[PDB]
Enzyme design. Structure first.
Site, PDB file in Angstrom:
ATOM      1  N   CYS A   1      30.898  41.583  37.433  1.00 39.49           N
ATOM      2  CA  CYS A   1      31.099  42.377  36.641  1.00 39.49           C
ATOM      3  C   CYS A   1      30.052  42.313  35.343  1.00 39.49           C
ATOM      4  CB  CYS A   1      32.453  42.406  35.846  1.00 39.49           C
ATOM      5  SG  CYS A   1      33.494  42.769  36.938  1.00 39.49           S
TER       6      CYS A   1
ATOM      7  N   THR B   1      40.138  33.947  38.176  1.00 34.86           N
ATOM      8  CA  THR B   1      40.993  34.196  39.470  1.00 34.86           C
ATOM      9  C   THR B   1      39.878  33.756  40.501  1.00 34.86           C
ATOM     10  OG1 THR B   1      40.500  36.461  39.574  1.00 34.86           O
ATOM     11  CG2 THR B   1      42.522  35.749  38.235  1.00 34.86           C
ATOM     12  N   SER B   2      40.462  33.522  41.778  1.00 31.27           N
ATOM     13  CA  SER B   2      39.810  33.454  42.938  1.00 31.27           C
ATOM     14  C   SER B   2      39.030  34.666  43.390  1.00 31.27           C
ATOM     15  CB  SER B   2      40.586  32.738  43.771  1.00 31.27           C
ATOM     16  OG  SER B   2      40.686  31.419  43.690  1.00 31.27           O
TER      17      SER B   2
ATOM     18  N   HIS C   1      32.271  36.018  39.181  1.00 31.22           N
ATOM     19  CA  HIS C   1      32.520  36.805  37.903  1.00 31.22           C
ATOM     20  C   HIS C   1      31.457  36.846  37.089  1.00 31.22           C
ATOM     21  CE1 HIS C   1      37.003  36.682  38.923  1.00 31.22           C
ATOM     22  NE2 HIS C   1      36.775  35.300  38.908  1.00 31.22           N
ATOM     23  N   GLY C   2      31.580  37.946  35.994  1.00 31.92           N
ATOM     24  CA  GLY C   2      30.385  38.129  35.164  1.00 31.92           C
ATOM     25  C   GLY C   2      30.868  38.891  34.011  1.00 31.92           C
TER      26      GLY C   2
END
Ligand SMILES: [Cl-]
Ligand SMILES: [Cl-]
Lengths: 4, 146, 94
Positions: free
Chosen positions: B135, B34-35, B93-94
């Site tokens: 994350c 997601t954005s 993200h991660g």
């Protein structure tokens, strides 16, 4: 509030 | 001279150093990620904050995994002799040990290895700061009442 | 005569190992907005580890998630400072  | 102490990093080189901000907001549709609404607020805040600390800030937006690795490689091959420190901010993200390019993951170790003492000689003995908004898994902290 | 190749790194993680990290779509992420605030207020005053400790307390105390989804509601976050630094770090000098 959103998660990454 | 008089007695000298060496407990603090030398931060009075002519330049504070680079602040590389990687701001990944929009991801390739095929990844299903997601954005990341709100990340531009983060990137702007960081740019201003490190500008006032006299860092040479470079903002980069929506980089693929390939572009992230080449950017870190190129930056690590600059001459940092006149610079006090190095800062890299990753917004993406991660999961544990990983941050995402727009098209797939990058091992954080691959990014930081470019700045190893033996691979970036002009940053030897200089602080190398990696700030990671991403994350590290999917656990949630329920907290406890005080 | 040699220093470790892993020496003099600091990793300022937004969240503890294994955990989600929270980002508000209007305000920015809990961690980055707290980090910038504490750098703004304390970079001419405090050593960097003490600044990041103020960031830990700000995130830990002032933020809690709001969600219509019970799985994601009322959750907390602690950031995670990982230091291989060998000296104190002050952003000011002289
Ligand atoms: Cl945004
Ligand atoms: Cl070093």
């Amino acid at each position: 509030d959103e998660v990454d | 001279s008089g007695i000298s102490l060496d407990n603090s990093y030398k931060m009075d080189y002519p330049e504070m150093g680079l602040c590389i901000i990687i701001n990944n907001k929009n991801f390739h549709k095929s990844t299903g990620m997601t954005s990341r609404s709100g990340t531009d607020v983060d990137a702007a805040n960081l740019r201003e904050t490190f500008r006032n600390l006299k860092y040479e800030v470079r903002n980069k937006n929506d980089l693929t995994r390939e572009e992230i690795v080449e950017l870190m490689r190129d930056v690590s091959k600059e001459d940092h002799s006149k610079r006090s420190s190095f800062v890299c901010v990753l917004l993406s993200h991660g999961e544990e040990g990983i941050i995402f390019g727009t098209n797939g993951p990058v091992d954080l170790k691959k990014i930081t290895n470019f700045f190893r003492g033996d691979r970036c000689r002009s940053l030897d003995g200089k602080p190398k700061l990696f700030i990671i908004q991403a994350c590290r898994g999917t656990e949630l902290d329920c907290g406890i009442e005080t | 005569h040699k220093i470790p190749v892993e020496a003099d790194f600091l990793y300022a993680y937004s969240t503890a190992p294994g955990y989600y990290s929270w980002r508000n779509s209007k305000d920015g992420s809990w961690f980055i907005q707290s980090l910038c605030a504490m750098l703004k207020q304390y970079a001419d005053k405090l050593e960097f580890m003490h600044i990041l400790t103020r960031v830990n307390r700000k995130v830990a105390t002032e933020f809690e998630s709001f969600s219509f989804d019970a799985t994601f509601h009322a959750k907390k976050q602690i950031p995670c400072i990982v230091s291989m630094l060998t000296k104190e770090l002050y952003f000011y000098h002289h």
